[PDB]
Symmetry: C5
Subunit: 198 residues, 5 copies
């Protein structure tokens, strides 16, 4: 098989609107943010403008193929695949995707999507001009799929040396969101960005 | 039936351009705004820039399926469904949808759509820097469907603690709009946002 | 017939790219602006930023149906219909349509489209801070269809009480535009907005 | 034949992705800018924001029809026919088209497209607040078709009377661009906009 | 064959989503930035806004045709072709393409795409107001294709009306590797040494 044959099988098999639930188990989505830049910080409005690479992985085993005598990975446009409907709950601008909208599909049915996103958040900016810094919390989860359909699991080298800001620490913790609006729970990742002005 | 089969049947049955009137009854659309952030307020121009979650529900009974041995809910792209043509009558910017454009369809034909919207309005901003605050009224109804085709019904834990502003009170009241030139009435929800700048 | 049948038949019969000229007569397009807000006025650059509801009507008799025992009006996406190629001749920004892009089609073939438009114009802003006010003229006509293919005819309750400005008077009169290049005449509506700062 | 039939036959015959080269001759494209407004001028960054009507004409004989007993002109969405891939070489913003994206097609195969464009340019703005004014040069030619495939030829009542600026002169001159990465030459029109602030002392 | 026939065959043959790997070779992509303008520089935030023409070439041999008695080049909309998924690793805005999105396809299967791009970057702006200038490094490589699928190989153009002048542009092959991935991503590193006039 060549790349074309692997991509054709994926296009015939993949259902972009259908969550690939195995049995009645949630789809396990891994999310890991790598901060690249902090561009604009407003301590009065408590807003920050950041660039991050959102490493997103999950499994769709119907897409699997025998790669003993074939390429074991291909690039695929996301419009041909199911992709998790992730959103940042405290975003105040739409996510601006800076990179080509291609995913990698691995021969065992693993899918990998790593968009570069520039986006604006409402978060705690107090202490940014201090030694201890500000801690800005970013919450990322499925918008429409509760914990029984999608589970989200989190997993300095990447941060631009040319930022006015410096990263002290990034903490990524599993979490769940619930409102009076809904009987169900929505899993998220809580990303704590502890940073300060240089 | 699996999710694929439910979504396939929805695609065969759904007519995104056709209002799902049951008999000839108006489609009852429930709208409920949850305020998340107030970003920009101008007391001189009487403009506000807000983020809100617009919880929108209605029923389309042709989408119903037997969920005895199937999932009773799926996520569906709104481009596959009829969605009410709601507009904010005092908006001065296009609604910016910040979330994935997916609805939930229940096996009994109930549809739920909850976009996060950032939008700019023309409204009364006087008193925002006072203790009693400003009251900004937002009016949301069907643009093209009068009261015989679409009825609109309204129904702190959501608001960002990091806003410069705080919410004193939110009131959502049914209302109707009618102009002298035309005989038809357009139902809307009137959302009264009573808020102020935090003191400090 | 139900709404679905009327909309299906409209899709089969409507030719969105074909002007619905009856015989060899111009299509009569009726245009009526209702001013909602005046957001920005610049006396030095002679620019204004306005919101208006553009009530637009015309007739396409091929869309007609027997409504004796069916609904006599439906909402239709404008991408399914012919729409007049109207333009504001003194606009300096793209028209931002704020409302759903749906028209109403009546069973006799009358079409109604009322977009909410935010747009910026180059016009006479002198006297805006006086008691008599400024008179800003907006010209709206077909961009590509001369007077033999499209004719344009014009026809307090709407204006926001929260504007910094107030409307003294709005007058809408028929007009025709011609340039030294083109041998043909383009019909327009001339909308005179007499307004002032509060 | 009625308008529907003419538009259907144009859809059948037109190849929007195929340059309509007659023989082995370049397609002769005529371009003529009419300046409507000058919105923003920055003498420090040497940037201008202008609105202009770009009268664009060419011929595509495979669109032709017998108009002895039918309309001799129709309006056509530009997505339905071939349009020249014109670009402004010194643009620093995308062209914002303000008007309906319709061309006029004549029964002899002549095509006319006149978008209203708002766009920002990098050009010489020095002298705008002087009596002799600034001369801002705008260069418009095919982006991908050299002089053997596309030739470009250029051809007061249009300019807004309400502008802060006044136009002293507009000159439109044929020209050719070449680079050392290319054996071929790209034809352009060079538009010299000589303008200044009104009401100086 | 006329232009219509060549374009029709390209439309039938082209696979926009399939990297045109010949044999087991990485696709050799040649990238060359021509700087046209420097519009906005902020020495405090270390941001620049630039216009550049990105001359990009590669080969797709399935597109080849016999041009002995036909045109040997046509213009093709990029949406009909495979195009390398290049990204600027230090970009802080989307690339704004200012030009018609057309590639040239040559009868031997060579593809040429030269978009005009306006884009904002995070880079070293210190020294811009000095005689030796700032050196702003831009890194451009495949986002999703490692070195075994895509290989990247690198005055007349610059606007005389910029507030800035270019002292030197150096374009050097490079490779990017993270703990994130076992794989290496080839890039071009473009060093723009410029200063205020
Ligand atoms: O986690 C990551 C992977 C990164 N890259 C490779 C990559 C791998 C797979 C996908 Cl679907 N998309 C991209 C970009 C490289 F140039 F750095 C960056 O951050
Ligand atoms: O009413 C609500 C439901 C909200 N969400 C879940 C949800 C459920 C169904 C749909 Cl169609 N869309 C979204 C977001 C969650 F992350 F909180 C927000 O407020
Ligand atoms: O003339 C008018 C009719 C208005 N509306 C109803 C309407 C009717 C028909 C169409 Cl095609 N579009 C809209 C909006 C309503 F909320 F008022 C506004 O101004
Ligand atoms: O040269 C011109 C032609 C202009 N118009 C007529 C026109 C005719 C054909 C086409 Cl394809 N596009 C436009 C607009 C009218 F309002 F004047 C303006 O400037
Ligand atoms: O390298 C280059 C080629 C340039 N042009 C010609 C061209 C050739 C091929 C392609 Cl696919 N796209 C464009 C633009 C011309 F107007 F100069 C400029 O920079």
């Amino acid at each position: 098989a060549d790349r074309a044959d692997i991509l054709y099988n994926i296009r015939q098999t993949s259902r972009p609107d259908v969550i690939p639930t195995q049995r009645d188990r949630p789809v396990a989505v891994s999310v890991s943010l790598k901060f690249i830049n902090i561009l604009e910080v407003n301590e009065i409005t408590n807003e920050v403008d950041v660039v991050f690479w959102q490493r997103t992985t999950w499994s769709d085993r119907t897409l699997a193929w025998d790669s003993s005598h074939s390429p074991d990975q291909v690039s695929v446009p996301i419009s041909s695949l199911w992709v998790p409907d992730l959103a940042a709950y405290n975003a105040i601008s739409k996510p601006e995707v800076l990179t080509p909208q291609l995913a990698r599909v691995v021969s065992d049915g693993e899918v990998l999507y790593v968009p570069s996103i520039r986006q604006r958040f409402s978060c705690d900016v107090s202490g940014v001009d201090t030694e201890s810094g500000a801690t800005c919390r970013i919450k990322i989860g499925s918008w429409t799929h509760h914990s029984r359909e999608i589970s989200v699991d989190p997993t300095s080298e990447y941060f631009s040396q040319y930022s006015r800001f410096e990263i002290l620490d990034v903490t990524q913790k599993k979490n769940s969101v619930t409102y009076s609006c809904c009987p169900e729970a929505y899993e998220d990742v809580e990303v704590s960005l502890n940073f300060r002005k240089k």
